[model samples]
Target: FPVVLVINCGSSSIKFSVLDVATCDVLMAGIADGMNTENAFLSINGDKPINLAHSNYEDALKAIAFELEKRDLTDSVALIGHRIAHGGELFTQSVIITDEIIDNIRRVSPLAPLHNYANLSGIDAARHLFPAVRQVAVFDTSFHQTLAPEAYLYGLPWEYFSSLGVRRYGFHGTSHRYVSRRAYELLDLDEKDSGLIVAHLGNGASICAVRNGQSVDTSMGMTPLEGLMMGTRSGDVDFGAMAWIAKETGQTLSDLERVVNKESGLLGISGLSSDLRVLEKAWHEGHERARLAIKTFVHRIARHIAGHAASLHRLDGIIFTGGIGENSVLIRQLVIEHLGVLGLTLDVEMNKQPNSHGERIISANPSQVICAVIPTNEEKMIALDAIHLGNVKA
Candidate 1:
């Protein structure tokens, strides 16, 4: 049984899955969390976590390799796929990883230092773990490569775009692609005639406009820090305001960059935890700041959903995915309430269904624009790509 091993590495976490490529069944899956920290641990298929204290990516992957060895599935791996967070126009589709591919990834590392560097670590470690196996790199920016210049271009100078390749390259390409295809099936809409707005609202959030199965516009920019308000990211800040802060506080660009990316957003506003579940509880208990942060987050989502409609010929449906999108009933309801002008009327009761209920429509029967919750499967998408590309090479 040929299997595809998928690796999705973030700055401090690693999520790995092994899937039977032919049947797309997950044989094993787990995550290594809190890497480089004293609290680091590996959790296998939701079992008791194993200590990985202060472990780096290579050590964490070694633990993963040990797990596969224990299951006797190590030799079954035919192809490996890495979820690379940035491509920067260097890659327009999934490709087999090679020396040149690794070099190009490094070239784009400055564009997404947080992700690309971590992704490379995973790739390097996997190479050592499975020396003979072929590997593929599936980029999060590739799907949005279909984005028109009008939709992706910033108002900034052409040199920044041309010289540095500094144009909007949307993140969550795999998630948007998976959810949008699912949306087409669930809504029974023609792939060629459909228009969809997909919101992926994890701690790192993004909204995408998929028209006729292609990404026409997306909320994320050259970096994931643009678009929607994320857990710790301050999205869509004014340049002038940023300049003022730098001037008033005598802070370097580096310091302010860290502030906007790490210290802002829901966590900054609430002055507490970044988790929505915690914020929701606080809101119910009349914590004003938490309530405000949530309201602002919802408001931004609604605005992006409506704003993205300008890129489509028609609005057929809006999909919610990712952790917050799938689980936060209140977030969905509030966003829908604000989108009344777009004819999106949410069935509050339907929207309240637990995440365990899985994919389902949450719009009123007569609502012109349908709303749905579709769980994303980026690992599946990566594995499938690995299978396709791995075979094409053979």
Candidate 2:
């Protein structure tokens, strides 16, 4: 079967996966980490993690192409899908990557400084390596294209909105869209009738409210740092607090932003590492700060969930995805426990089960809302777009 290669390129890393689109099975997947590291690492098919020192993303792609050829997958490649973080109000759907598209992407790089350029780098490298292969750009903002003006607008001066394009363009839109659609499938509900709040809890986390397959609201505004307490991000802090921190520490707005956006949240609050697994270990060791950090994380998530519930007056359930939401039992317990006041409860036994495809309802009795941990597959979503955009004849 022909394959669709889905690549999600970040600032310093590229996550590539080869999927058998017809069968919906991942043939191979890997991460090319530390793009500029002297001892960069590449993990293929999530196996045999190796170090390729001084090898950049282009080299990584060459390595991936070689790996695929070795596995008899070189000729099977059809379309490649790249996940571009911000579409910047221009791209609302997946499209073939052209020179003009690249220019538009470059123009919007400032809107997603940490992501857009790198994403384009991977795409450019892939295009150079495979000139005949069709490449598609899948926007993370595409799903949230459905957001109304009122939901996305900020109360700032109108000029900033008009001139600088300052507004709440949501992130984690791909995951939110995938989980919401999955929730509809799992609940056997009408796709157009579903109202959901999706909590994508990972290193870069956010909450999104989906009503009838359209994003009604989301937490991260314009960037990934504006949402639920992430691994390092201090989500939803007051601007006044930012100014005060700058004043007290003799720092500038940039410095304060560096701390809140890169050094705060779980790491800063607990004085521990950003990894939730490590935080969980510290919590078990009776580390007060670690415990507090977990509490704060869960509290913020529940608060966001509550806020989204108001937006979704007839919310059928809550969907949790991303790394923490998918794998961390402790985080899930903490979040659901916090929602006891809202009559949302979890089945402990169900949540702890060893499974990857987490689409089952994990809610217990007397809960009006159904809670489930649906493992998000943004790669699959991207593949769907690529197949449609390329119109690859079967």
Candidate 3:
């Protein structure tokens, strides 16, 4: 079976997974954490970790290739897929990596400084390591390219829109698209006519409204900093508030940016951990701040669900994905409670049951709207696109 290697590179970490495309199974996956430092460690297949001193993305890719070759998995790979965070309207679909594509990724780095460069580094490293294998760049922003002008545009000056390329280019399109398509399949609904609001609620959260298998609207705007309150990010803050805080604290714009995007949200609100499970435990133990943090998180998600609901002509279902969305039973229950007005009620027992594998419908049988837990597989989505584009004869 021909496999597809998926590379998801972050600022300080590189995650690599080899997927058997024919069987849709992960042959092996691992991450190199603390890259560029002595603390760097590589773990393959959740086995014993290995420390690789003074490692970086290039070194990490070298380690990954070494492991694949050691496991005799290198020859099975047909193509590689790199998760490029922002394409800036230039790429609406996955394309084979080229020098021009690399240049374009670099050109759009300003829009996603934290992501695009790291992604490019991974892509370059993969290309170097596997020169004969085809590589594809899958953009996180590509899914929201279907957004209408009115939905994506900000109410700024015309010049900024015309020249600066400032608009609501949503993030997490891969996760949203994957989960929404899976949701349609689970609900036995037509993909072309299904209306869905997919909540990709991990540490970095976003909600997307999908109509007829296309992204009609999404929460993240211009950058991933917009949207739901996340583990560290203070989502949807007013610009006036930002300026006022900067003026009061006598801090630079960059300082304020760091505060909101890194210091706020669950961490700031609870003054504790950003991990939802930890917060939930604290909330159960009567930690007032933790309780408030959880409440605020659920409230904001429900509010956005209600807000995005208006964008859909018919609500076939709502999907919950990502880390928190798929796992947190309490969060899902709380969110559905707030959306009861829309006749969205959960089957409590079903919701409470742990989904160790596969999708599950958590909505009550009598509920008007379908609510489901669909574990997102962004890697698989990227690999499928790569396979189709590469036309791998295998």
How many clashes (backbone atoms < 3 Å, residues ≥3 apart in a chain or on different chains) does model 3 have?
1
Order the candidates by TM-score, highest first: 3, 1, 2
Weakest 10 consecutive residues, lDDT, candidate 3?
385-394
How does candidate 2 fare on TM-score? 0.94
Per-residue alpha-carbon lDDT of model 3 for 210-236, expressed as tens digits? 998999999999987888899999998
lDDT of 2 by residue, 1-394 (tens): 8999988888888898899979867878899988877878888866798877888878888888888898998898998999999999888777888899999999988998888888988988899888899989989887887878888888888998899998888887878888888888887778778788899998989999988777888998888788788888999988887777788989988887789878999999999899989988998999999999999999999999988777775878888889888898888888888888778868888888644645778888778888888998888888888888877542
Which residue pairs of candidate 3 clash?
Answer: 36-55
lDDT of 1 at 153: 85
Q: Name the regions of candidate 2 deviating beyond 4 angstroms.
A: 46-51, 392-394
How does model 1 fare in lDDT?
0.91
lDDT of all the models against the reference?
0.91, 0.86, 0.90
Which candidate leads in lDDT? 1
Question: Model 3: runs farther than 4 Å from truth?
Answer: 392-394
- What lDDT is reached at residue 6 by model 3? 93
